[PDB]
Structure formats: structure tokens, C-alpha cells
């Protein structure tokens, strides 16, 4: 979840 996504 969260950098699930995309931020790292």
C-alpha cells in the first residue's frame, strides 16, 4: 500500500 503505487 502507498508506494504501491508510484514514490519510490
Known amino acids: 500500500i502507498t508506494x504501491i ?3 519510490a
Open 5 to 7: 503505487s508510484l514514490c
